[PDB]
């Protein structure tokens, strides 16, 4: 009833939705060939949010999967539900933007975001109401955070009322397995700040150590990083497509949550996972939910949430529940951590409660914070830029494109005034 | 062998995440209490057969089920013990009554249904046939 | 005759109403699918049900009221529920988009273009009816399209209907616990519409029937089904003495002679005593002496509000159920012997009583037990003083810094509406004070 | 079976052999289809 | 006794008589066959049936109607449909080269040479009738058969017939949608004609009975069979008191001599009111007073237009079914206390009222469902000029440019006919701003 | 009852109506050898348009088929439905033409012109009411442009109150087959515009385009190619020959379509063209009809409408349908790029709607329109005329059969009026 469509960039974008579209997949229950086999109808009402049809019950998602290489759109039909992804929404380039920003914005990328625009228009013109734009790309990559970047201020020339969503895999702070990472991080940082309405960070590592201390997995390999995300990719936007108590849509969960334009970073979470060892041993209920989310070992950002205060926090509740103990415990989360929070808003926690769990999941939530303690995840690309740019290195590869200097002295001056509205509210 | 995507190396799969063509089992699987529909048996049907009819009550016709036409969930959790949804618990024990009504203090209307009559004007009129007196 | 609207905005109104509806359809002998088994014909006429239903000439009666909402997730399950085949298709009004939050959204870019239909169903409402008494507007103070679309639908049915009868079953914001960050904005600049749209305004803070339920009625966890029953009994018990026969009846026309002083203090109350499980009054009477003891304690109010700092002014008691007056007097006469429930100076009566001969039927499945009688009072306080000065006080709070106003700028709004919303709130706070 | 095989092909097409190998997909489909249509055009049929 | 002869020229005036008249064959007992069985009469002289069909001998009613276009595809069609019995070989007009959205072949010699076998048509028509009421009209301004020929055809009636009532059931151009580009000059040209030689004119406009669809039906897949099912109901509603038993019935004369004031404001409005699913049947009671305030809307128009700018002129009430006449009186009082609803100084009581006590029918897999109670209203106001006032600047945008002017002059015709087809619409435009005001 | 007679000059017309004439044999169904085999009745109601009927219920084909050289009639002898063409409806001539005009114009076809007009003579009275007449040829051959346009002449003073369609086949933009092109191309195209009352062009250049892109066919042949005209060329006689709510046959489709005289330059398209790879992934419903003909890439003339503005558009529909959804999505595409249709005539849309779709289909659409956007396909020609005629270059091949100097002048001076007479429009 309410269109979403789901925008890409490079490799990390495919490899994300990819499992986006095996947890979607299955909670409504599709086969891999496109045809429903769920169980029940809750499922085959709200079908369209994310879908389109066909006849003979022929689902295909509405997905525009776009990169520069024809390398890795055949590695997303080699997955299991690669069968349902469309060829017309397969814009490719043919050279590769191999870690940088130049040519993934202005060279390469400036003349295949002609097409992609014309997929994106064609698709958001065969419906009856978008609500946004969602989009999955790296900060870190070239073809993720150049063309992405250039794809999202290009969209909201034309439409200039909705609502996106970047879900951004921002760089981890240890491991760096590309040297030039500061400058595409920078370089997008710049744009995401004055177009962008919501911001969800998300961390690697940050992933790798739910996998270790909150799942404990041995070997924990990307499709488990990938399949967490994705199920708070699901969490988000949960209320819009299953009716509930008290529901919560994309639009509501940003003017609950933004008071300012510059200031619109969030870091998301998820709160029912736990290990195979020591899953019997705990019953299941809101108490263990609510403990579960307000401790800085659930979260998927790079940032301690000790070190900042939240401005404000959304939650959203899947499955049956009462919610009486719901209120009592956000209550008392907010009595506990007084000092966690800021003391110039009286209430800061929304609460929204769908009816329907995930699959193989009873009762399943979903949080999506803004915190005080992004900045620190700034400050460092921060240094790390003024530091390697200050001896002038890597300059040949952003300056013989066309490019110029002012540009990264415009992204260093964008980051000291967005860090210090941020540090006043401390 | 007619062609297989190199599977995968085992350094690939992980022990969260696998998604099959869920078979579920007979009945007791879901949170939903049913089996799972059983699906088109052949896609050659979906592709090369369609029968060209806007049916008559849908905005378009590749939304099928735009007013849920054709979902059948009112049904549905009358065959389930506990209602999916928290709004079947409003109407769902009436069919077993607590109480029987009473029927004797009411707001029955007597002034507008008794002094008024049809149409007949008989005050002028002969009594006729049929006209029993007490 | 004696015909009533009710107006549900929001999903707030719209699961209130679907408790408050099963409680019609059950309190009648009506089917869920709107049949009458025993119609006019059989056992005498009745005309009990016309305060609620219109019958058709085919039996299939269909109710008297407007859902409205502007996201169609809460309509589009009873659109396919239980009650699927009562209402007409047309008072389920569903619009695209999501008034999400915001005073905005609801009153300047969406409420100017769906209201037309609602005011064109609610007119042939009006031309089905020949006997109106008045409104009874469900919406929440909180929301966004329980604040906007349903205040900007109050400024337009004042200058329609002209002087009507206006009764509010509003949701209030609590004081500690809240859902959104934004409460504060729509429960205020909605207030500084319905100073004027308005005749009574009755308070319904959810808290308060939490702790209802969890120390009267005995039920840990309960649900939102647990509460709009509640309601729904509240509301029904409200216009009880119109669709049937007691002693002393009641219309809604004395309510507002009755429990309104000033046109600017016109804010009462509510409250229900004999809420108690089939456990705890299995083996204990509930007489009418006690059950009027038992409202006037903090410890039942629907509200949180303490009376003991408050000048209760103008109150009124419509009584249901099995009762004799005398022992009513006897009641009265009892409790303004008492110096901790203190009546303002120059009110000497402030009481009204109505009787009804009917016992409250109990929904299966709900914990009400089925008790002889129900005493429902609406009393009238200067204390809510109290509760609008926290509001005003977090409003300076986090006003101070201009939080938010970026977002409630651009949509049809400006700071002007900002800045005189809050000098209303103090002259209402100053009204209330001179009084008391 | 076909169909899912000629779904697995490369996105874009530059060799010769994925070439040759898409054109023998097709015209496996077009004697599958053919053999379906002659069977599905009337209801009885002889043999 | 009261014979109406009906004449459908153009495609449109075809599709819509094929509908019309397959609802005049249900509303009494006549088969697709043309007989009607023992078992659904009355057992003497019903007098009925003799509105539109006439009596062979041989238990056969043929209907009083022709069917007249210049291309064989709709006509030969009806020839092949489920009713190629009913309507006889001779009743039928072919021709070859349609007209082809173009009035430059209204005056030529292929335009001359077909008008004579109608006019013979309707002259032995007419000849079986001894109780001729008048003729209704069925054609299209937009196209070029239902447009040229049909002037011609009613320029020669008007020579021929004398002083006889004439009323068209014509398709106006929509406001936004159109069909054809040269539809303007082919209406404006065409509405020159329809002033000296017409009583009265009942406009249609295809998206305003879309929308009403939509609005009140929830269908989508309004083809022209939806549509023509809802003309037929209006047609069939307003001939209901030559047919049918009333309290009050109303004749066609005493239509047009209580509608139209002068010889130049004869352009009503149409409405019909309880248009209702069979699914909202059930749950919205169709009483006197909420049928005939459903008229009044403007939402309900079956013109695209506004009266609440505009002003009421005259009124035509046309009850059907059970009516009981203190509920019209009561509702008519009711319907005088709106201010919304303004009347002109010169019309003090502004109504006409009907009663009819055969209830509506109902077509099998059809529309509507079995309504007992039907309201169709025929509202002359002078608000049915702005359709003029945007028709004229349309025409005005297109000339003085020459545009689509070289096939209308050289096909025989003249170029100074367009000249004063703006002249004498300036002078109705004129006409119908000083009788409102 | 209104039939219509068909001409074909040169290997190039003769090539397209060979699959013009095996599209029509099949969707009216008659077999190779020449009997109906259909199985509906509505396939037999109006089949004199095409098919006058002979001995033993054959079907003979009302065609003329005329050619400079035998060569090319023993492949269309040799054909699939070869069999069923009369065989005395030949006429060939001993010496081919090979790319020029005076051959076809003065020498050989002028010759041969008094047997091409005497079949067409006892072809044209033996039919009840004729409609008019049909040619295909090639501007840039030798006996198409050179001989099948003295038709146009001849046929023009013999019925001078018949319609004149020509599906005429404009040089490509970028390579061209023949160097002396433009000559034979422009000295017919100047004629053309006093004798004819319709035009369109078809270049094989934007054809590729379409059988490369949008059907992803693996070696686009001509055959591919001509298949692909003859959609159109059976799209524009629809209701001709079938039923519908709302009919159109040529006459209908030419006072609707060009204003002026001079204008009768139209440029179609064709609506259900999907990649066999993409088949299951859309239905051709409404909007993916109507939306396919507003596109670029879908046109069969090489000129980008963008550039230009559109005069008059039409839509011929198929298939069992109705008109709210339609005349919604006309209007929707009239409405959104209104800077793409000019003003000062206010509706510029036409719709037919028969209901019997092609075999294989079910719901069918056929565009025609005139653009300013035709201007830039005589732009490129009157410049090669005028680069080419300066130098004096090829002159020598036409005027030794006696043609005159300033002729040339005369054609680029009419076709120079045609250049200043479509640019004021736009
Ligand atoms: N007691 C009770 N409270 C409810 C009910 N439904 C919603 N509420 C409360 O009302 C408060 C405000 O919610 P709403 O007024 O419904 O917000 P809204 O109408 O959705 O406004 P939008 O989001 O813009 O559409 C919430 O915090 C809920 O706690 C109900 O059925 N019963
Ligand atoms: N409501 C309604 N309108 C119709 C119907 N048929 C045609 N029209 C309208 O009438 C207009 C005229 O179209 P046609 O009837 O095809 O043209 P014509 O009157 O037959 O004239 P020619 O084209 O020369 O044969 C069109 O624009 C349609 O919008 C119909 O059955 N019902
Ligand atoms: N969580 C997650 N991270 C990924 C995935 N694929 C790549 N990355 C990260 O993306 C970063 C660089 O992205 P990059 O390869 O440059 O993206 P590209 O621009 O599209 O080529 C690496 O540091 C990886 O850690 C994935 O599937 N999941
Ligand atoms: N699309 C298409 N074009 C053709 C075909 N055959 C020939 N042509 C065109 O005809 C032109 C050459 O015609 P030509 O042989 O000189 O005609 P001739 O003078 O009669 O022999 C080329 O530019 C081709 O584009 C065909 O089968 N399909
Ligand atoms: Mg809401
Ligand atoms: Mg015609």
């Known amino acids: 009833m309410r269109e979403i469509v789901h925008l890409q960039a490079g490799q990390c974008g495919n490899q994300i939705g990819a499992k986006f579209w095996e947890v979607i997949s299955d909670e409504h229950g599709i086969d891999p060939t496109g045809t429903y086999h769920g169980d029940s109808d809750l499922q085959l009402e709200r079908i369209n949010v994310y879908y389109n049809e066909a006849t003979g019950g022929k689902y295909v998602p509405r997905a525009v999967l776009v990169d520069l290489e024809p390398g890795t759109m055949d590695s997303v039909r080699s997955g299991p539900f690669g069968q349902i992804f469309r060829p017309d929404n397969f814009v490719f380039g043919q050279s590769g933007a191999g870690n940088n920003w130049a040519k993934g914005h202005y060279t390469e990328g400036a003349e295949l975001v002609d097409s992609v625009l014309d997929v994106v228009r064609k698709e958001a013109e065969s419906c009856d109401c978008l609500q946004g734009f969602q989009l999955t790309h790296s900060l870190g990559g070239g073809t993720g955070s150049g063309m992405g970047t250039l794809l999202i201020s290009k969209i909201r020339e034309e439409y200039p009322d909705r609502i996106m969503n970047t879900f951004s895999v921002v760089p981890s702070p240890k491991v760096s397995d590309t040297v030039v990472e500061p400058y595409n991080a920078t370089l997008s940082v710049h744009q995401l700040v004055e177009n962008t309405d919501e911001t969800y960070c998300i961390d690697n590592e940050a992933l790798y150590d739910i996998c270790f201390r909150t799942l404990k997995l041995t070997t924990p390999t990307y499709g488990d990083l990938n399949h967490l995300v994705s199920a708070t990719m699901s969490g988000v936007t949960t209320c819009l497509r299953f009716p509930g108590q008290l529901n919560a849509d994309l639009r509501k969960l940003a003017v609950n949550m933004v008071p300012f334009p510059r200031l619109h970073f969030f870091m998301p979470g998820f709160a029912p996972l736990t290990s195979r060892g020591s899953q019997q041993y705990r019953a299941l209920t809101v108490p263990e939910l609510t403990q579960q989310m307000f401790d800085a070992k659930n979260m998927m950002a790079a940032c301690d949430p000790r070190h900042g205060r939240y401005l404000t926090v959304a939650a959203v509740f899947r499955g049956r529940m009462s919610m009486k103990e719901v209120d009592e415990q956000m209550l008392n989360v907010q009595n506990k951590n007084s000092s966690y929070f800021v003391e110039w808003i009286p209430n800061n926690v929304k609460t929204a409660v769908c009816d329907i769990p995930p699959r193989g999941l009873k009762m399943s939530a979903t949080f999506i914070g803004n915190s005080t303690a992004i900045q620190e995840l700034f400050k460092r690309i921060s240094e790390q830029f003024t530091a390697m740019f200050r001896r002038k290195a890597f300059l040949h590869w952003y300056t013989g494109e066309g490019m110029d200097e002012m540009e990264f002295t415009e992204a260093e001056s964008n980051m000291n005034d967005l860090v210090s509205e941020y540090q006043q509210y401390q | 062998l007619r062609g297989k995507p190199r599977p995968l190396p085992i350094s690939a799969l992980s022990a969260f995440s696998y998604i099959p063509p869920r078979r579920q089992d007979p009945k007791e699987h879901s949170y939903y209490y049913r089996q799972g529909w059983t699906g088109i048996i052949s896609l050659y049907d979906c592709v090369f057969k369609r029968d060209p009819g806007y049916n008559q009550k849908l905005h378009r016709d590749d939304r099928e089920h735009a007013k849920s036409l054709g979902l059948r969930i009112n049904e549905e959790e009358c065959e389930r013990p506990v209602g999916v949804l928290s709004s079947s618990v409003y109407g769902r024990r009436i069919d077993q009554p607590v109480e029987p009504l009473n029927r004797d203090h009411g707001r029955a209307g007597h002034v507008k249904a008794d002094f008024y009559r049809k149409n007949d004007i008989t005050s002028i009129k002969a009594p006729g046939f049929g006209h029993i007196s007490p | 005759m004696r015909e009533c609207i009710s107006i549900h905005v929001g999903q707030a109104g719209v699961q209130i109403g679907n408790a408050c509806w099963e409680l019609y359809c059950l309190e009648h002998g009506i089917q869920p699918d709107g049949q009458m088994p025993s119609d006019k014909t059989i056992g005498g006429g009745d005309d009990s049900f016309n305060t609620f239903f219109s019958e058709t000439g085919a039996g299939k009666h269909v109710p008297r009221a407007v859902f409205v909402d502007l996201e169609p997730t809460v309509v589009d399950e009873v659109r396919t529920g239980t009650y699927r085949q009562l209402f007409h298709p047309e008072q389920l009004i569903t619009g695209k988009e999501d008034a999400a939050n915001n005073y905005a959204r609801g009153h300047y870019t969406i409420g100017k273009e769906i209201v037309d239909l609602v005011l064109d169903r609610i007119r042939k409402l009006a031309d089905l009816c020949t006997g109106l008494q008045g409104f009874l507007i469900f919406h929440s103070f909180g929301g966004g399209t329980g604040s906007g679309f349903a205040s900007l639908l109050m400024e337009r049915l004042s200058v329609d209907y002209g002087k009507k009868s206006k009764l509010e079953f509003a949701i209030y914001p609590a004081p500690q616990v809240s859902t959104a960050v934004v409460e504060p904005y729509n429960s205020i600049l909605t207030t500084h519409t319905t100073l004027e749209h308005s005749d009574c305004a009755f308070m319904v803070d959810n808290e308060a029937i939490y702790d209802i339920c969890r120390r009267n009625l005995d039920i840990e966890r309960p649900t939102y089904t647990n509460l709009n029953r509640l309601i729904g009994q509240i509301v029904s018990s409200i216009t009880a003495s119109l669709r049937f026969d007691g002693a002393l009846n009641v219309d809604l026309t004395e309510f507002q002679t009755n429990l309104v002083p000033y046109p600017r203090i016109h804010f009462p109350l509510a409250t229900y005593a004999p809420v108690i499980s089939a456990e705890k009054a299995y083996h204990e009477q509930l007489s009418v002496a006690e059950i009027t003891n038992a409202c006037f304690e903090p410890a039942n109010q629907m509200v949180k509000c303490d009376p003991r700092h408050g000048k209760y002014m103008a109150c009124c008691m419509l009584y249901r159920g099995d009762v004799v007056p005398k022992d009513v007097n006897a009641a009265i006469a009892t409790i303004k012997t008492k110096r901790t429930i203190q009546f303002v100076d120059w009110c000497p009566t402030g009481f009204k009583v109505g009787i009804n001969y009917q016992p409250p039927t109990v929904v299966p499945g709900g914990d009400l037990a089925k008790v002889q009688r129900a005493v429902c009072m609406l009393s009238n306080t200067t204390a809510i003083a109290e509760a609008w000065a926290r509001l005003d006080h977090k409003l300076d709070l986090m006003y101070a810094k201009r939080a938010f106003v970026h977002w409630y700028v651009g949509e049809g709004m400006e700071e002007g509406e900002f800045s005189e919303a809050r000098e209303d709130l103090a002259a209402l706070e100053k009204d209330y004070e001179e009084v008391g | ?47």
Not at chain 4, 1 to 21: A, G, M, N, T, Y
Request: glycine share 2%.
């Open chain 4, 1 to 47: 079976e076909v169909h899912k095989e000629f779904q697995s092909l490369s996105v874009f097409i530059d060799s010769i052999p994925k070439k040759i190998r898409k054109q023998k997909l097709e015209e496996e489909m077009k004697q599958l289809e053919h053999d379906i249509g002659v069977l599905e055009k009337h209801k009885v049929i002889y043999i």
